Design a protein around this ligand. Structure first.
Ligand SMILES: Oc1ccc([C@@H]2Oc3cccc(O)c3[C@@H]3CCC[C@@H]32)cc1
Ligand SMILES: Oc1ccc([C@@H]2Oc3cccc(O)c3[C@@H]3CCC[C@@H]32)cc1
Lengths: 211, 233
């Protein structure tokens, strides 16, 4: 099981499961089409996340239905890091704030995504940390919304895996040369950003469902 | 000055700052819940002003943070006092409601279930009072930090301060866990478990806002009115 993997094995498995960066094939049309194609790759990526396939199909579907937008958004923010002021939806679709005003209700979300990307840049987020965070989102997002006996076991499994990913993040920070205090401070800084990603996803859904 | 406090002083400060538990007044379930939340807001501002470092910020930034986090703060408070009442939500000592009593208002039951699950999680983790106050302060400082308007030197200075205080609370959380006898690995694991729940609290607040808006002076001006006090008294 995933509970037996080592910190380096975890990082390795995660880096390998990384989906491909797709290209865009009016604006909403392009964003949703892109999202639709990425979803297919997300599902394959998910199954590769240590511990995911150990859950019931029903629960696998639940976690994905709950975390897909947060997962797409953290990916967007990650590839937009080296591009201050712009969101790299796709290599051939790099948009700025003004282009966001185009659609209604869209710029407010663009601004939050931009701010998040800036925070990651400021923190100098590493690719190893990024994959860990994305996996955390997948497992954490829908766990608080699955009282049956079967649920107990599922949740227990999820939490153990999450603990493993936490150890991995800490491990990465240790090898990076951070002091213990710096380590736990960065761990918290990174997890607190997940709350903002949840927020952006909620708003993204409000914007999506509003049309 | 808040950045020089020790872990123990940080904890004592937060504990001392705790707001009072209000009673429901008296039925319109929403009327009761909203009136209760309205009266608690007044006390929330007093509590916020007592959170180390909060008053060093500008009035504008203080209002923005509270406008962003008020419902999360009310909800974590609710979940906290509901910990000893499995299956029920203790909105107030005289307003303990169960799941079915939530079906009396469309779209309320889904939120109730989320709050109830959060309460069970806290109970399952044996959340400590010292940890609860640290978490509530983190919500206050973190929820709206990523949505600050300007990027002026002043703004950059405020964000630096907020992140510095947040690091301090993180230090305090780890200190509490260390004194509890947990190993370093258990400390890091619990810290993560606690912070991930804030993601769920953020989620509930958003669903709560959507619900509140389904049943519509702007909140900002109301918070500003109360935060912008004079010194004649
Ligand atoms: O990889 C990605 C990441 C984000 C997007 C897009 O992000 C945004 C951002 C702002 C407003 C939106 O409606 C969307 C839509 C809503 C669904 C997602 C899609 C598309 C592809
Ligand atoms: O201390 C507290 C905590 C929560 C509440 C109530 O919590 C809920 C829960 C579910 C649906 C709601 O509309 C509310 C309303 C929306 C505003 C808050 C209020 C009231 C007082």
């Amino acid at each position: 099981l995933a509970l037996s993997l080592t910190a380096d094995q975890m990082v390795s498995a995660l880096l390998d499961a990384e989906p491909p960066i797709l290209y865009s094939e009016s604006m909403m049309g392009l964003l949703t089409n892109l999202a639709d194609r990425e979803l297919v790759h997300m599902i394959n990526w998910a199954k590769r996340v240590p511990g995911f396939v150990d859950l019931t199909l029903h629960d696998q579907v639940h976690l994905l239905e709950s975390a897909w937008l947060e997962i797409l958004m953290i990916g967007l923010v990650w590839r937009s890091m080296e591009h201050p002021g712009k969101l790299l939806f796709a290599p051939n679709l790099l948009l700025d704030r003004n282009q966001g005003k185009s659609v209604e209700g869209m710029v407010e979300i663009f601004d939050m995504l931009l701010a998040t990307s800036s925070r990651f840049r400021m923190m100098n987020l590493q690719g190893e940390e990024f994959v860990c965070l994305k996996s955390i989102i997948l497992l954490n997002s829908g766990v608080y919304t699955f009282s049956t006996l079967k649920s107990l076991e599922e949740k227990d499994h999820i939490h153990r895996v999450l603990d493993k990913i936490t150890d991995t993040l800490i491990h990465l920070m240790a090898k990076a040369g951070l002091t213990l205090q710096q380590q736990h401070q960065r761990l918290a800084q990174l997890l607190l950003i997940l709350s903002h990603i949840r927020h952006m996803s909620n708003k993204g859904m409000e914007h999506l469902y509003s049309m």
